[PDB]
Amino acid sequence: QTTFGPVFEDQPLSVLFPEESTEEQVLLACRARASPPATYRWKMNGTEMKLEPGSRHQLVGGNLVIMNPTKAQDAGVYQCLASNPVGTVVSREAILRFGFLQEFSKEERDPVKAHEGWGVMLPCNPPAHYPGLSYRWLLNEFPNFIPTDGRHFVSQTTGNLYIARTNASDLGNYSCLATSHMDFSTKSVFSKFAQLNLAAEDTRLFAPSIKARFPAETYALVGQQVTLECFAFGNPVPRIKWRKVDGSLSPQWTTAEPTLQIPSVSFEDEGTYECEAENSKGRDTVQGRIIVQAQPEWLKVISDTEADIGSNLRWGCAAAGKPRPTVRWLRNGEPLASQNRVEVLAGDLRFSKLSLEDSGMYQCVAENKHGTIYASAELAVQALAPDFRLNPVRRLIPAARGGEILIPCQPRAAPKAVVLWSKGTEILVNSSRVTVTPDGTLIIRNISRSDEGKYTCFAENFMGKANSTGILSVRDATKITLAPSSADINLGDNLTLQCHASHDPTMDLTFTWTLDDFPIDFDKPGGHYRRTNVKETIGDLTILNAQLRHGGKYTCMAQTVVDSASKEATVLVR
Amino acid sequence: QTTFGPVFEDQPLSVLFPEESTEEQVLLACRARASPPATYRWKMNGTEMKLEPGSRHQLVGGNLVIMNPTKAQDAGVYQCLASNPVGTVVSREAILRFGFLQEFSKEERDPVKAHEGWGVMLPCNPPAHYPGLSYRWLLNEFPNFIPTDGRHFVSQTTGNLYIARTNASDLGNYSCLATSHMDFSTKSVFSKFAQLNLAAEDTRLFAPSIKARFPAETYALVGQQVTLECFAFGNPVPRIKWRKVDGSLSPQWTTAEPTLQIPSVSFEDEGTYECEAENSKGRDTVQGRIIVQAQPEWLKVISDTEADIGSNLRWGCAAAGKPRPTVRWLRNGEPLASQNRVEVLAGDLRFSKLSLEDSGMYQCVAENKHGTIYASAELAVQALAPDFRLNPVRRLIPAARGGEILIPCQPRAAPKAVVLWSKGTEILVNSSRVTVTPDGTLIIRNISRSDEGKYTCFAENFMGKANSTGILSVRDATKITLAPSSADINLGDNLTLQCHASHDPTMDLTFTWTLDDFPIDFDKPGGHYRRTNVKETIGDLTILNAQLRHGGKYTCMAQTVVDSASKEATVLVR
Ligand SMILES: *[C@@H]1O[C@H](CO)[C@@H](O[C@@H]2O[C@H](CO)[C@@H](O[C@@H]3O[C@H](CO)[C@@H](O)[C@H](O[C@H]4O[C@H](CO)[C@@H](O)[C@H](O)[C@@H]4O)[C@@H]3O)[C@H](O)[C@H]2NC(C)=O)[C@H](O)[C@H]1NC(C)=O
Ligand SMILES: *[C@@H]1O[C@H](CO)[C@@H](O[C@@H]2O[C@H](CO)[C@@H](O[C@@H]3O[C@H](CO)[C@@H](O)[C@H](O[C@H]4O[C@H](CO)[C@@H](O)[C@H](O)[C@@H]4O)[C@@H]3O)[C@H](O)[C@H]2NC(C)=O)[C@H](O)[C@H]1NC(C)=O
Ligand SMILES: *[C@@H]1O[C@H](CO)[C@@H](O[C@@H]2O[C@H](CO)[C@@H](O)[C@H](O)[C@H]2NC(C)=O)[C@H](O)[C@H]1NC(C)=O
Ligand SMILES: *[C@@H]1O[C@H](CO)[C@@H](O[C@@H]2O[C@H](CO)[C@@H](O)[C@H](O)[C@H]2NC(C)=O)[C@H](O)[C@H]1NC(C)=O
Ligand SMILES: *[C@@H]1O[C@H](CO)[C@@H](O)[C@H](O)[C@H]1NC(C)=O
Ligand SMILES: *[C@@H]1O[C@H](CO)[C@@H](O)[C@H](O)[C@H]1NC(C)=O
Ligand SMILES: *[C@@H]1O[C@H](CO)[C@@H](O)[C@H](O)[C@H]1NC(C)=O
Ligand SMILES: *[C@@H]1O[C@H](CO)[C@@H](O)[C@H](O)[C@H]1NC(C)=O
């Protein structure tokens, strides 16, 4: 019933298109549920695209289809806007990134001079790539495989060889290679040879000197695997120990391998770590830190709301992320700034004197360095004509003579309706005796046998007019013309109390007695209370075989179907 | 929208059709508002009429028209029934009565012998009539007029002459006449002559003897004029005094005329009256009573009601009349008796386990000897499929670690819906840790990092099925790792209190201090409270220039957007 903001059900997702692939198209999906159905626009780097006919970019039911994707003119960030007569909404981002691995530079590698017994550096300066590759080293023949012993180390972050000790077998020509691991294809690129030569021998057992070290500060989101690498020059082969300064490591990680690995990281891993190289000739240690961060997550969002013209509203948001997020507001896909009767403050939204214009689709955005999140809601403002169906004025208003009466008149209206009372055809301007409160309730005091008749309440606003009618009748009031008396007796004695009343001739009158505000039962078998002198106006009560519990404050009450009256006395029982 | 019982707006009215008139038709009106429009039937003495084509009785839009009305076959009591697919209603009665005045009997009146100086009786036995007539007497000539002095009296309830004293001028022949006073026509009927003759006489004065007296018991509704007549035989002309035994008469009625009149009667006139004839030779007095009564009137009626299948209902009625009325119930124009799940008792109606069949038009009838009154209402029973629009399950359910959570699931259904919970795709059979109450609320104790996910509630009844979904997430809980200490100081001293807390790394934590559960202000200019050691986990407070009012129980509370914790201490100031 045209009460459908363009709610989202499928927002686009980031893609990594491999280069030199065998595909021809990519799809970015956008799906909205709306009534009437919504229309879609696509933003690329912010500027609204001009989706011409089927030249490259095309629209298929809200999904974006690019043709012949290439990094030259298709890599970017894409957004989808779903618009309706009610309002518009904006979806989350979708990044399209390409993947490739170029060819190694063709110039010859310089020959590194070495002296037998020391350590040497063999870098292999990997070419441009995306994403990170896996590195290996080759010697002499293709394909051989350099052994992965404790004498050599090949880091996976720079790839340089770490030849701890140099001897005769190290003569040859070293080449690097890189392997790209992707979902679709795998590529391997080899490097030109670098012939290493060794000078005269010089061997002495020396203290380790740490060369490959993990950086002091290492940021890592919660859920990622972290690998800290460590290596030192030492003869004989040193041993590497990993420890935590402000804690202890899990037994699954208490290993002496030169690369400490954490498969999953939570907030308990944040702290300081120490890598120590140890041998019979020395020891060298290096410290560093690990910091854990997280993306924002919602804690409290907004929801759909229908209000009425003239009222006020309050809306809120709340997020949670390790670098604290910031919250901002959107109206129909546009930034919302504090103006007029809309007040925004750091994630709370206030509407004062809500109007008809304030209806639409609102959005809440929480952002930090690691990501952004969205939430949507709809505000609808309603105007209503006066209606008395739910709360009509009482049809029958029996009022005792010489008393006060109050008749409220509150129709269901939006905004509030002006209320005017009348009796018959005359219009009531209030006086000392008749009063008309601003709320519309009409109160009459000092009632008599001349106020009976038909009363009408008229409610009007700029939307409509309604009206209701009641009938007022007057009767005589109840009276108590005799009150009982206090007494003191012994347990097991009999006492009598009297109570007389007068009432209107046309109604029924009943007598009820309470003991300390507790109604006294007379139909109880073996009961100690008996009605006596039972007439239309006489309702005496006799206590037979009095007990301790019968002491207290007795209260006689004469009640009709309309009103009541009461009198009090007390009895003590020993 | 087919929610219209045949409400009444014009019910028939009693008529008095004068005989020997010049009219040819009568109309009895019946009007009902209904949607769809209602159909009408007419009852005459109770049997449903067979309204044939236009032979005498005819129907015009719900109104009844009889043709050539005559007392022979048209005088009765008429009722109108308005029927709809929703239900039927029955209107109040309407009595049709004729009015006429026949011709006086043609036989000669007997000659009444009289003895001069006495009193004589001259009745005139009025013929059949409706309604009561006005009586007058004629003597000798037509038209003469006998004087209305104190010597003669002509009562209006029997019409007989009361000649107090008889003398020579009383010789003649007396005739009666009756005049019928109606709205349309006036008719006068004269009677044959009765020749009165007089014998010898005497000469003396005697005591009065009352002859025409008012009856001892006289019933009179509220609003009617009551006339009590009195006369006695007395020479000379006696005087009549009217008094009240248990009260005093109004000055407008304290008159000595031989007919006491009350234009309007209220309940204060009920009692005993005395008429006294007085003269120089004697006095005779006669007593009687006046009893005042009233017709039933409503005090509390029923109204339209929509309920749901499976519930219970209570309805009531109340009337007021001097002869106490009796209340009975009608369903669709038929008497309602206590059967099955409907219980009737002396004006209260109880529905137990309301079904779909109990929908329709109900009516309440209050009756006594002086009249009857009706009231109408409609009962509608609704069945509803489950719906979660008004009360959906919470979308975000942040739960602290190691605590308890409760999630209710109450859809809008009629009757109640069976509720089954599930996590993901598994079905939860409830145990020590997880409990599913009969109301549907699911409670989990001892929450860990294994309970997060998506929870679903399925509600089903014989009308339909619906479901709702929520998301559960777990976070660390707040703590207070340091509590303050009690102290005693003098007015004007400075005191420091400490309070430390721990919380989840991704949320904000704030400290608030209260004095005897009243929040302590820190931004108050010239305030005595200053925040100190303000860190993320340290929120100390210092009292500067302490006053008497600063003594009491301090409470430090560390709170987040989700949960909170608190600790207490006390300070005394002299
Ligand atoms: C106090 O009462 C009413 C509102 O509660 C207010 O308006 C009048 O009465 C009804 C409101 O229900 C208006 O509509 C009428 O409804 C009745 C039955 O529900 C019908 O009989 C009426 O028939 C009219 O049909 C034509 C088109 O509507 C009219 O042109 C024609 O004249 C008939 O009246 C009608 O549907 C109704 O129109 C108004 N006005 C009148 C004059 O009745 C009412 O005026 C309030 N009283 C006062 C003194 O202000
Ligand atoms: C828990 O969720 C729902 C109840 O809330 C329950 O019913 C299923 O989902 C929707 C409920 O809104 C049913 O109606 C669907 O609505 C969505 C969008 O609102 C549409 O995409 C669906 O399209 C259907 O259209 C045809 C005619 O309706 C179908 O024949 C066709 O197969 C499409 O599904 C449809 O209008 C929906 O029918 C049901 N059922 C299913 C299978 O979705 C849902 O089953 C509950 N889940 C569980 C596990 O019990
Ligand atoms: C009715 O009479 C009162 C005086 O008793 C007028 O004054 C109002 O009284 C209400 C009672 O609570 C208060 O709100 C104010 O003292 C008055 N209200 C306003 C709006 O002035 C009142 O104005 C009279 N109503 C009319 C004339 O419609
Ligand atoms: C859930 O476990 C409880 C036991 O703790 C089962 O017993 C019900 O517990 C409620 C709790 O107030 C009580 O009404 C009764 O003791 C039991 N109710 C009924 C209808 O038997 C309960 O049945 C379990 N829920 C299930 C099985 O759905
Ligand atoms: C779009 O954005 C990307 C990344 O910010 C940028 O590389 C590119 O040059 C932009 N413009 C295009 C694709 O036309
Ligand atoms: C109520 O009205 C009557 C007049 O009808 C008057 O005599 C009486 O004093 C009024 N009540 C009060 C409390 O003034
Ligand atoms: C109808 O009722 C009246 C009054 O009770 C009665 O006089 C008459 O005979 C009845 N039958 C008719 C009018 O056919
Ligand atoms: C709460 O659960 C944990 C494990 O999740 C358990 O070790 C602990 O004892 C439980 N609490 C209580 C009070 O048993």
Side-chain angles (χ1 to χ4, degrees):
Chain A
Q1 63 294 200
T2 182
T3 316
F4 263 50
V7 157
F8 257 122
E9 63 162 295
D10 205 338
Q11 301 156 81
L13 257 177
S14 319
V15 313
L16 168 90
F17 185 71
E19 242 167 74
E20 44 84 47
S21 45
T22 179
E23 285 69 22
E24 79 293 341
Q25 84 174 37
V26 287
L27 191 95
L28 289 120
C30 188
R31 285 195 39 77
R33 159 165 47 102
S35 174
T39 73
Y40 302 103
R41 279 160 287 138
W42 281 87
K43 284 167 104 275
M44 170 204 177
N45 273 327
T47 71
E48 275 224 25
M49 271 155 88
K50 292 303 114 184
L51 309 189
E52 281 301 282
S55 275
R56 309 257 281 113
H57 312 70
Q58 298 152 2
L59 197 94
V60 175
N63 299 359
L64 187 54
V65 172
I66 309 121
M67 213 38 57
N68 277 352
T70 321
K71 186 197 258 306
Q73 68 284 62
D74 316 303
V77 181
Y78 296 62
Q79 259 209 324
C80 175
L81 315 102
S83 70
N84 225 23
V86 186
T88 88
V89 291
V90 175
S91 65
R92 60 147 190 263
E93 315 271 13
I95 324 185
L96 178 135
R97 240 178 276 96
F98 275 59
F100 69 111
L101 157 69
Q102 306 200 349
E103 180 47 270
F104 218 131
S105 72
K106 275 301 298 169
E107 79 277 335
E108 203 63 35
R109 323 210 57 162
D110 319 59
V112 164
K113 192 68 213 54
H115 276 64
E116 202 164 32
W118 280 308
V120 282
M121 173 55 18
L122 292 184
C124 77
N125 58 12
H129 64 277
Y130 189 30
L133 324 158
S134 48
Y135 297 4
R136 285 124 75 148
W137 274 87
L138 269 280
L139 191 56
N140 298 131
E141 308 82 13
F142 258 66
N144 197 263
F145 258 131
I146 277 304
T148 38
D149 43 8
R151 214 156 163 259
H152 324 319
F153 187 61
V154 190
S155 157
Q156 307 312 284
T157 198
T158 323
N160 315 342
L161 251 175
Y162 286 121
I163 294 308
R165 195 242 162 179
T166 283
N167 63 337
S169 79
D170 287 317
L171 214 35
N173 43 47
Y174 296 76
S175 41
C176 191
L177 80 86
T179 42
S180 191
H181 272 30
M182 272 191 250
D183 164 88
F184 290 95
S185 94
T186 292
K187 196 185 168 195
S188 40
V189 166
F190 99 87
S191 95
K192 267 276 193 157
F193 279 98
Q195 198 168 349
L196 165 86
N197 56 320
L198 59 90
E201 174 90 85
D202 209 20
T203 42
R204 287 96 173 77
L205 309 174
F206 49 81
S209 172
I210 170 168
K211 302 310 190 207
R213 91 215 56 237
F214 55 101
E217 245 165 8
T218 300
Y219 308 97
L221 269 60
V222 56
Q224 303 198 342
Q225 152 176 52
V226 188
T227 41
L228 313 99
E229 68 172 48
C230 213
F231 186 63
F233 277 129
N235 202 20
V237 168
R239 290 183 223 233
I240 295 286
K241 334 177 187 308
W242 282 77
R243 278 88 179 240
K244 182 152 40 175
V245 164
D246 53 347
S248 60
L249 308 175
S250 178
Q252 303 181 333
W253 314 326
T254 53
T255 324
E257 33 175 358
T259 49
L260 178 67
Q261 62 278 317
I262 315 167
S264 169
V265 170
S266 153
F267 282 91
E268 71 269 3
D269 295 293
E270 172 172 17
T272 301
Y273 287 84
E274 218 171 287
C275 157
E276 190 270 352
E278 164 59 36
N279 85 317
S280 166
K281 293 304 141 177
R283 50 189 309 284
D284 288 48
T285 173
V286 152
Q287 310 196 321
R289 338 169 68 257
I290 291 186
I291 328 178
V292 179
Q293 286 148 353
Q295 315 204 327
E297 290 148 39
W298 281 123
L299 275 193
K300 177 199 315 303
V301 305
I302 50 183
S303 49
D304 301 285
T305 296
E306 335 190 22
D308 71 336
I309 176 175
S311 58
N312 300 335
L313 199 38
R314 165 187 301 281
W315 262 349
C317 268
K322 165 99 172 29
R324 252 71 171 178
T326 73
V327 181
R328 72 171 178 271
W329 295 87
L330 304 181
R331 182 161 123 71
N332 282 35
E334 286 310 281
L336 188 62
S338 192
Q339 89 282 63
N340 286 333
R341 21 185 190 77
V342 167
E343 169 188 16
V344 292
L345 185 66
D348 47 57
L349 173 70
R350 301 192 176 76
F351 296 108
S352 301
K353 261 180 278 319
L354 209 53
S355 163
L356 267 282
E357 184 267 334
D358 296 359
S359 317
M361 293 296 279
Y362 287 74
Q363 253 188 310
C364 197
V365 185
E367 180 151 21
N368 82 333
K369 141 179 59 179
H370 290 346
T372 169
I373 39 181
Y374 296 82
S376 316
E378 164 163 28
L379 177 63
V381 160
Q382 294 172 0
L384 302 176
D387 195 7
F388 276 100
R389 177 166 32 85
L390 286 200
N391 277 53
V393 186
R394 321 173 26 94
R395 285 292 329 190
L396 276 313
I397 320 165
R401 192 171 209 220
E404 269 180 10
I405 212 62
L406 308 102
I407 318 164
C409 189
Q410 299 159 344
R412 165 71 179 152
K416 281 275 290 303
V418 188
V419 154
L420 196 85
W421 277 94
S422 83
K423 170 187 176 183
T425 49
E426 312 169 353
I427 305 313
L428 268 72
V429 296
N430 74 26
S431 170
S432 69
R433 214 172 75 99
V434 48
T435 302
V436 186
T437 57
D439 295 45
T441 87
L442 169 139
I443 167 162
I444 321 174
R445 320 184 172 80
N446 199 211
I447 213 70
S448 85
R449 294 199 175 270
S450 157
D451 314 307
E452 52 262 40
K454 218 166 301 307
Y455 293 75
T456 306
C457 172
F458 300 94
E460 303 205 38
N461 60 21
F462 85 108
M463 191 75 38
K465 166 186 166 328
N467 83 338
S468 178
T469 298
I471 285 179
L472 171 58
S473 293
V474 307
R475 323 269 173 167
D476 267 345
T478 320
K479 179 164 176 332
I480 308 267
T481 179
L482 187 61
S485 299
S486 310
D488 185 16
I489 48 183
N490 172 33
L491 197 150
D493 292 345
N494 300 347
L495 173 63
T496 307
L497 301 183
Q498 206 141 19
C499 194
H500 294 174
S502 68
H503 67 310
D504 188 288
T506 38
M507 276 169 240
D508 294 319
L509 181 125
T510 67
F511 287 131
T512 48
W513 302 46
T514 68
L515 169 59
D516 296 319
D517 313 319
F518 140 72
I520 285 182
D521 54 41
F522 305 104
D523 297 325
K524 189 176 184 175
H528 283 327
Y529 303 107
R530 172 182 287 185
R531 322 274 307 113
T532 318
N533 301 324
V534 182
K535 293 187 187 172
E536 195 176 358
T537 59
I538 304 184
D540 308 355
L541 159 66
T542 304
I543 311 170
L544 304 173
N545 324 297
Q547 303 288 309
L548 286 177
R549 59 173 174 268
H550 305 164
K553 197 182 73 158
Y554 286 76
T555 306
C556 162
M557 149 151 51
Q559 193 215 340
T560 72
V561 201
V562 155
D563 59 336
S564 68
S566 56
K567 282 297 183 185
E568 272 80 2
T570 182
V571 179
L572 188 75
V573 185
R574 313 184 184 190
Chain B
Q1 54 287 312
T2 183
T3 316
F4 263 50
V7 159
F8 257 121
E9 64 162 295
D10 205 337
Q11 301 155 82
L13 258 177
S14 320
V15 313
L16 167 92
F17 185 72
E19 241 167 74
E20 37 88 35
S21 35
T22 182
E23 286 69 22
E24 79 294 340
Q25 84 174 37
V26 284
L27 181 91
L28 290 119
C30 188
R31 285 195 39 77
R33 158 165 47 102
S35 174
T39 73
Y40 303 102
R41 279 161 288 137
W42 280 88
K43 286 167 104 276
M44 183 203 158
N45 279 311
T47 71
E48 277 223 23
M49 271 155 88
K50 292 302 114 184
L51 312 188
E52 275 318 292
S55 273
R56 304 189 60 153
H57 313 72
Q58 299 151 2
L59 197 94
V60 175
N63 299 0
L64 188 61
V65 277
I66 314 109
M67 220 40 57
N68 277 352
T70 321
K71 178 194 260 305
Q73 67 283 64
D74 317 303
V77 181
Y78 296 61
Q79 258 210 324
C80 174
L81 314 102
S83 70
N84 225 23
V86 186
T88 88
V89 291
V90 175
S91 65
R92 60 146 191 263
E93 315 271 12
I95 324 185
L96 179 135
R97 239 179 276 96
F98 275 60
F100 69 111
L101 157 70
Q102 307 200 350
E103 179 47 270
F104 220 131
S105 72
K106 275 301 298 169
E107 80 277 335
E108 203 64 34
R109 323 210 57 162
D110 319 60
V112 163
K113 191 67 213 53
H115 274 65
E116 189 165 30
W118 310 358
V120 283
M121 174 52 18
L122 291 184
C124 76
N125 58 13
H129 65 277
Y130 189 29
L133 323 156
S134 48
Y135 298 3
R136 285 124 75 149
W137 274 86
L138 268 280
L139 191 54
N140 299 130
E141 307 82 14
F142 258 67
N144 198 262
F145 260 132
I146 57 152
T148 38
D149 37 8
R151 214 155 165 259
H152 324 319
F153 187 61
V154 191
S155 156
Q156 306 312 284
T157 197
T158 323
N160 315 341
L161 252 175
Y162 287 121
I163 294 308
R165 195 242 163 180
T166 282
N167 63 337
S169 78
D170 287 318
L171 213 36
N173 33 48
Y174 296 76
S175 41
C176 190
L177 80 86
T179 43
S180 191
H181 272 30
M182 271 192 250
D183 164 88
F184 290 95
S185 94
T186 292
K187 195 185 168 195
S188 40
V189 166
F190 100 87
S191 95
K192 266 277 193 157
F193 278 98
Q195 198 166 349
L196 167 83
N197 54 320
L198 60 95
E201 41 172 335
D202 275 328
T203 300
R204 80 282 328 285
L205 317 159
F206 51 84
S209 172
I210 170 168
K211 302 310 190 207
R213 90 215 57 237
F214 55 101
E217 246 165 7
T218 300
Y219 308 98
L221 275 84
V222 298
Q224 318 218 318
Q225 152 176 52
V226 187
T227 42
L228 315 99
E229 68 172 47
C230 213
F231 186 62
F233 276 130
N235 202 20
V237 168
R239 289 183 223 233
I240 295 285
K241 333 178 187 308
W242 283 77
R243 278 88 178 240
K244 182 152 40 175
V245 164
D246 53 347
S248 60
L249 308 174
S250 178
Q252 303 181 333
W253 314 325
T254 53
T255 324
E257 34 175 359
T259 48
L260 177 67
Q261 62 278 317
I262 314 167
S264 169
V265 168
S266 152
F267 282 91
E268 71 269 4
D269 294 293
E270 172 173 17
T272 301
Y273 287 85
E274 218 170 287
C275 157
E276 191 270 352
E278 165 59 36
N279 85 317
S280 163
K281 291 303 141 177
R283 50 189 308 284
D284 288 48
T285 173
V286 152
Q287 309 197 321
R289 339 169 68 257
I290 289 188
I291 315 170
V292 58
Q293 275 151 5
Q295 295 196 348
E297 290 148 39
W298 281 123
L299 275 193
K300 176 199 315 303
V301 305
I302 50 183
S303 49
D304 301 285
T305 296
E306 321 186 49
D308 66 345
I309 178 174
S311 58
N312 300 334
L313 200 37
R314 165 187 301 281
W315 263 349
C317 269
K322 166 99 172 29
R324 262 63 185 288
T326 87
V327 180
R328 65 162 179 282
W329 295 86
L330 304 181
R331 182 161 123 71
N332 282 35
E334 285 310 281
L336 188 62
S338 191
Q339 89 282 63
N340 286 333
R341 20 186 191 77
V342 167
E343 169 189 16
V344 292
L345 186 65
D348 47 57
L349 173 70
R350 301 191 176 76
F351 296 108
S352 301
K353 261 180 278 320
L354 209 53
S355 163
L356 267 282
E357 185 267 334
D358 296 359
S359 316
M361 293 296 279
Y362 287 74
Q363 255 184 309
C364 197
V365 185
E367 180 150 20
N368 82 334
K369 142 179 59 179
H370 289 350
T372 169
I373 39 181
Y374 296 82
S376 316
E378 164 163 28
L379 177 64
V381 160
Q382 295 172 0
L384 302 176
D387 196 7
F388 276 99
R389 176 169 32 85
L390 284 199
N391 212 8
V393 188
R394 321 174 26 93
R395 285 290 329 183
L396 276 283
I397 320 165
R401 193 71 161 290
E404 270 180 8
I405 209 64
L406 289 98
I407 318 163
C409 189
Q410 299 160 344
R412 165 71 179 153
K416 281 276 290 303
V418 189
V419 154
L420 196 85
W421 277 95
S422 84
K423 170 187 177 183
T425 49
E426 313 168 354
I427 304 314
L428 268 72
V429 296
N430 83 317
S431 168
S432 68
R433 213 172 74 98
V434 48
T435 302
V436 186
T437 56
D439 294 45
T441 87
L442 171 143
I443 166 162
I444 320 174
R445 315 183 173 82
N446 184 277
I447 274 186
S448 88
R449 179 160 298 95
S450 159
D451 316 307
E452 51 260 39
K454 219 165 300 307
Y455 292 75
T456 306
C457 172
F458 300 93
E460 303 206 37
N461 60 21
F462 85 108
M463 198 73 37
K465 165 185 166 327
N467 73 8
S468 177
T469 298
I471 285 178
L472 171 58
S473 293
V474 310
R475 323 270 174 167
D476 265 346
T478 320
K479 204 248 173 170
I480 308 269
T481 179
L482 186 61
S485 299
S486 310
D488 186 15
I489 48 183
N490 157 254
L491 196 150
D493 294 343
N494 301 348
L495 168 66
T496 306
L497 294 192
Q498 205 142 19
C499 196
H500 294 175
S502 69
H503 67 308
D504 188 289
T506 38
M507 276 168 240
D508 294 320
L509 170 130
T510 68
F511 295 97
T512 48
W513 304 48
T514 69
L515 163 54
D516 58 278
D517 316 317
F518 140 78
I520 282 183
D521 54 39
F522 305 104
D523 297 326
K524 189 175 185 175
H528 300 276
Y529 304 110
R530 171 182 289 184
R531 322 275 307 113
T532 318
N533 300 325
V534 182
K535 293 187 187 172
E536 194 176 358
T537 58
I538 305 184
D540 308 352
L541 160 66
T542 305
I543 317 170
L544 307 175
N545 187 24
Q547 304 287 309
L548 285 177
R549 59 173 175 268
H550 305 165
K553 196 183 73 158
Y554 279 168
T555 308
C556 160
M557 150 155 51
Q559 66 188 352
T560 69
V561 201
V562 158
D563 60 335
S564 68
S566 56
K567 282 298 183 184
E568 272 86 353
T570 182
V571 183
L572 188 74
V573 185
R574 313 184 184 190

